[PDB]
Structures are given as C-alpha cells and as structure tokens.
C-alpha cells in the first residue's frame, strides 16, 4: 500500500 | 518568482495506461523503466513513447514487489532494483537476467542507488535497520551501517562516492562518509515525520521529502538547513520526489504534480493527473523542463513545464 514507515 | 522561472503550467505530452513504485531514466535518458507491485520491471524508449499513439520493449518479471530502481551510470544496460523480500538485484536489461542478487537485508528494502563516480558501487536501505554498501564484483557487502530505524532512502553524493544521504524513520537524514562509519559526518533535523525520500541537486545541495507534507533543502557541505516547501498533501505514502540543477518535483496524495523552484518556498505550477489516487514515481529528464511522472492506477505521464 506504499506506507512511509515511521518510528513514532 | 519572475527573476528565477520562466514556467506556470506542465503540458502532457504523452500518456501509457498496479502501483508505480519507481521510473527512473537511463544514463543517456534514451530508455526509461518503471517498477512497482505488479513484479515486472518494464524499459519503454522515451522517443517511441513521446512520438507514438505503447509497449514495453523489455520486461522481466521478479519474485517480490518492487520498491525502487536506479540505472547503471556507466553500464549502459544495468539496472538495480530494490524489492520487498530485502533482495537487491542487478540486471541486465538485453539479456534479461539477474546478474546479482544481494540477499543480506532480513526485511524489505525501501531504496537502492547506483554510483555516479564509482559506478560498480550500490547502497541500499532496509526496514532491518541497516544500509549495505555493495560492489557489483563481490557478493558479499562491502559496508554494513547499523542504524536505529527503519531505512527509507539512500542516495549517494553525484561528485563523490564516499558520500550517502539516509532518510530515516526516525525524522532525520544521516549523512554519512563510508570511510568512518562509526558516526555520521551531521544529521539533520528539521522533518517532523519519517524521511520518504533523498536527491542531490548539486555536490553541496541535498533535498528531501517526508511524510510532514513538506520537501526540504540543506547545505551539506557547511550543515545547515536552506528551505522549506509546501503545498502539495503527502501525510503516509511515497509519492516521489526528483530534482535537478534548479527544480523539485513531487507528487501528492491528491493525484497531483507540484513542481517548485529551489529558491521559492511554494509550487510554481501543479498538474492534476487524469485519475482515491495518489501520484507514486516522478523523475526529471536531467536538467530539463520535461519529467515521466506515473501514479497508483499505473498510468505513465510526460510533463513538461511550459510557459
């Protein structure tokens, strides 16, 4: 689903 | 605005009618190729497309979905691709066979570059947290960075293969000289979300994007933050960013282009795509106004900033 990962 | 452009609007001059993860030109910009879920790396020749009323001239079909792509800068028929196994794969695009296939990373790999002055050299960036520096005569990595975060992006430096951008989960881009990587050369802060992209403009000029809904410039040669661009929506996906000697391209969550100036804060014009969509690969034409854009239904758009 080309999601960005993020850390928070 | 009048003092640096000489544009307003992006004219479509040819169209190819899922999710485009990736388009990327060729070293002489003759052939271009585009990647994505679908596990077919295609190559189109730019001149056919733009002349004619359109069928891939090479395909090669891969056991993963496709994150990304970079062409060889001095092999003229190599290609890298990055896939959602963590599998790096070199290709030979006459041939149609993998010529390396780097099985190191443990997740999906986000990004893949080929080096512009070391061109047997590769970096890639992976969920696993780690950037693997890789030469295309050695099966094994040359170079493992540790990292605290997911791995968005990786791009190396155009003047100097020592050098690799890493947009990072973790907010920030790491700048790094791969010979010490025991600590980055400068981090910079400034995105208030995870790094999705990073391109040089120029030796010194480094831009990114993030899922803050903003692109930024910094100075990598003196580490400071430049400049700040919004406009355009990009609140989750990779929506690609491209740029060149004097502009930055984006998509949007909004199924629109946005195109800004370095040197101007907002969009010098913006194209809404023929497509609940969202643009997904942009990719300029070296330092022309003409650039391949593609979006989630697929679709493949040349745009030219014109007058």
């Given at each position: 689903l080309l999601m960005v990962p993020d850390m928070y | 605005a009048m003092t640096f452009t000489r544009y307003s609007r992006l004219r479509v001059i040819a169209e190819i009618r899922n999710i485009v993860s990736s388009i990327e030109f060729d070293r002489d910009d003759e052939l271009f190729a585009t990647a994505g879920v679908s596990r077919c790396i295609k190559v189109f020749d730019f001149s056919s497309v733009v002349n004619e009323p359109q069928c891939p001239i090479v395909e090669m079909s891969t056991r993963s979905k496709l994150s990304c792509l970079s062409w060889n800068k001095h092999e003229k028929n190599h290609i890298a691709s990055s896939d959602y196994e963590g599998i790096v794969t070199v290709w030979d695009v006459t041939t149609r066979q993998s010529l390396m296939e780097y099985e190191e990373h443990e997740k999906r790999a986000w990004s893949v570059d080929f080096s512009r002055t070391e061109p047997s050299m590769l970096v890639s960036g992976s969920d696993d947290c780690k950037v693997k520096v890789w030469c295309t005569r050695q099966e094994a990595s040359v170079i493992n960075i540790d990292m605290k975060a997911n791995i968005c992006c990786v791009k190396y430096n155009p003047g100097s293969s020592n050098y690799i951008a890493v947009g990072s989960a973790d907010h920030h881009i790491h700048y790094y000289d791969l010979r010490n990587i025991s600590q980055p050369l400068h981090v910079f802060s400034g995105h208030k979300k995870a790094v999705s992209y990073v391109k040089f403009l120029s030796n010194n000029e480094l831009a990114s994007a993030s899922t803050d809904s903003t692109l930024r410039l910094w100075d990598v040669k003196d580490n400071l933050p430049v400049r700040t661009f919004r406009g355009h929506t990009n609140e989750?996906?990779?929506v690609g960013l491209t740029v060149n000697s004097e502009y930055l391209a984006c998509g949007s969550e909004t199924n629109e282009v946005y195109v800004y100036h370095?040197?101007?804060?907002?969009?010098?014009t913006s194209h809404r795509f023929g497509s609940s969509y969202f643009i997904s690969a942009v990719c300029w034409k070296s330092d022309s106004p003409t650039m391949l854009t593609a979006n989630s239904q697929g679709t493949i758009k040349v745009l030219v900033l014109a007058a």
């Amino acid at each position: 689903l080309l999601m960005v990962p993020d850390m928070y | 605005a009048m003092t640096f452009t000489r544009y307003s609007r992006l004219r479509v001059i040819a169209e190819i009618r899922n999710i485009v993860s990736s388009i990327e030109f060729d070293r002489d910009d003759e052939l271009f190729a585009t990647a994505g879920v679908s596990r077919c790396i295609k190559v189109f020749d730019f001149s056919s497309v733009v002349n004619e009323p359109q069928c891939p001239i090479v395909e090669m079909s891969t056991r993963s979905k496709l994150s990304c792509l970079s062409w060889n800068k001095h092999e003229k028929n190599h290609i890298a691709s990055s896939d959602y196994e963590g599998i790096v794969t070199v290709w030979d695009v006459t041939t149609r066979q993998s010529l390396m296939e780097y099985e190191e990373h443990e997740k999906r790999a986000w990004s893949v570059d080929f080096s512009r002055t070391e061109p047997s050299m590769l970096v890639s960036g992976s969920d696993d947290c780690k950037v693997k520096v890789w030469c295309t005569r050695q099966e094994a990595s040359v170079i493992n960075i540790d990292m605290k975060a997911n791995i968005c992006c990786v791009k190396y430096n155009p003047g100097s293969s020592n050098y690799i951008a890493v947009g990072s989960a973790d907010h920030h881009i790491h700048y790094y000289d791969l010979r010490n990587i025991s600590q980055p050369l400068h981090v910079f802060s400034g995105h208030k979300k995870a790094v999705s992209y990073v391109k040089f403009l120029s030796n010194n000029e480094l831009a990114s994007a993030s899922t803050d809904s903003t692109l930024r410039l910094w100075d990598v040669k003196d580490n400071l933050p430049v400049r700040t661009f919004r406009g355009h929506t990009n609140e989750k996906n990779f929506v690609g960013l491209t740029v060149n000697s004097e502009y930055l391209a984006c998509g949007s969550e909004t199924n629109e282009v946005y195109v800004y100036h370095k040197e101007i804060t907002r969009p010098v014009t913006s194209h809404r795509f023929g497509s609940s969509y969202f643009i997904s690969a942009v990719c300029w034409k070296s330092d022309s106004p003409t650039m391949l854009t593609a979006n989630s239904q697929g679709t493949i758009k040349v745009l030219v900033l014109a007058a």
